[PDB]
Design a protein around this ligand. Structure first.
Ligand code: HEM
Ligand SMILES: [Cl-]
Ligand SMILES: [Cl-]
Ligand SMILES: [Mg+2]
Length: 370
């Protein structure tokens, strides 16, 4: 594609200038390769996410079958998704976030204090993945299986179907013998009377919940630090106390939030950006691009850690909006405060970007804490 190739190495290195220039000329662009419309403006993406009867997550409504092991909260739309959405909401909001902050603060300090002895380490492998895996396991209330303590088989065909079937077996065992605390034990207690059947959709939803709370936050933590180190003065601003962590975390989500694209199936003919989107077509909300839309954010390509207001789309919108956003904020807030407790945070090599145009993240972030 002459205007946007998500996986072109030069694009992956810095996709935002490409996003910007696509937005300036074709804010609603039909991409033949991806076979989808590409919306790069905040207003269009917002409208795509807030009309489920017009833009659905259930691609069966345009007659594309859903694999049985992937029918879940994420691939259902109201009213089918409603009971599961509320059950998951109820289970999450029963969790003690203050207790989670306190124990994550401990873990972060332990990890970094051990890594402080290295001359150079990979922040992704040694912190982001380890930190976020501990957080999601504790939050859900399950223990890593001794034979796959990192859940590596499920990080992602028959192998694929076998991994998801194995994970579903673990979930059913968890549901049958819940631990003393966490989202999953609360789901079990809340399930009777929820309008949700303990069936494959529930099991699949627990699997999706785990992935939503593992790979996405891990990728964000890496992206955020990389942006702080690559933006002159950004880290020093934090070290000096010039900006508050709360606003800085929200600006980092807008600036380099990992979710780049949210696909929806068009169920009704709609005109967007002067383009005739037709029923049966796929639309992709490039929320990574929308979060740098100059119509919504002044100086959008500039990292302003004190930015206010900041109506970013990094946590989605509407019926499928993120349910773990307060956990994600605690994780980022804890990580930054823990890093700030070290006097020499600096890069120690070039970052390496994952070849992913949908969920942006780094595979290596060489770093040293001094
Ligand atoms: C920086 C971290 C995170 C970011 C940027 C993020 C972002 C998002 C976004 C954009 C969506 C919307 C997906 C869509 O509309 O299709 C979403 C959905 C979701 N997120 Fe997060 N998320 C993060 C962390 C978490 C964590 C830690 C959890 C679990 C505790 C979580 C649980 C979920 C769930 C369950 C959904 C699906 C809601 C539904 O489909 O009804 N997220 N997230
Ligand atoms: Cl402590
Ligand atoms: Cl219209
Ligand atoms: Mg730039």
């Amino acid at each position: 594609d002459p205007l946007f190739s998500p996986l072109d190495p030069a694009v992956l290195a810095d996709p935002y200038p490409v996003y910007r220039r696509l937005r300036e000329t074709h804010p609603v662009y039909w991409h033949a390769g991806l076979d989808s419309w590409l919306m790069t403006r905040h207003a269009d993406c917002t409208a795509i996410l807030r009309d489920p009867g017009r833009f659905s997550t259930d691609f069966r409504k345009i007659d594309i079958p859903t694999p049985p092991t992937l029918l879940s909260l994420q691939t259902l739309d109201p009213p089918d998704q409603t009971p599961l959405r509320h059950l998951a909401l109820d289970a999450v909001r029963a969790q003690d976030l203050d207790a989670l902050r306190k124990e994550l603060t401990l873990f972060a300090d332990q990890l970094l204090d051990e890594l402080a002895d290295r001359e150079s380490f990979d922040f992704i492998h040694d912190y982001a993945d380890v930190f976020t895996l501990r957080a999601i396991t504790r939050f859900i209330g399950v223990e890593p299986p001794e034979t796959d303590e990192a859940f590596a088989r499920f990080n992602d065909e028959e192998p694929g179907l076998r991994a998801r079937a194995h994970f579903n077996d673990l979930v059913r065992s968890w549901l049958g013998d819940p631990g003393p605390h966490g989202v999953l034990p609360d789901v079990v207690r809340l399930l009777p009377g929820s309008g949700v059947e303990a069936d494959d959709v529930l099991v699949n939803s627990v699997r999706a919940f785990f992935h939503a709370g593992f790979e996405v936050p891990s990728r964000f933590l890496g992206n955020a630090l990389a942006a702080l180190l690559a933006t002159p003065g950004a880290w020093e601003q934090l070290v000096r106390g010039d900006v508050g962590l709360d606003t800085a975390v929200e600006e980092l989500i807008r600036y380099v939030g990992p979710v780049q694209a949210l696909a929806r199936a068009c169920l009704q003919d709609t005109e967007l950006g002067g383009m005739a989107v037709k029923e049966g077509q796929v639309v992709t909300a490039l929320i990574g691009a929308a979060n740098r839309d100059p119509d919504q954010f002044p100086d959008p390509e500039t990292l302003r850690l004190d930015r206010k207001p900041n109506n970013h789309l990094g946590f989605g919108r509407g019926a499928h909006s993120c349910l773990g956003l307060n956990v994600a904020r605690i994780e980022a807030h804890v990580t930054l405060g823990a890093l700030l407790r070290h006097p020499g945070v600096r890069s120690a090599g070039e970052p390496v970007v994952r070849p992913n145009g949908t969920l942006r993240g780094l595979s290596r972030l060489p770093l040293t804490l001094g």
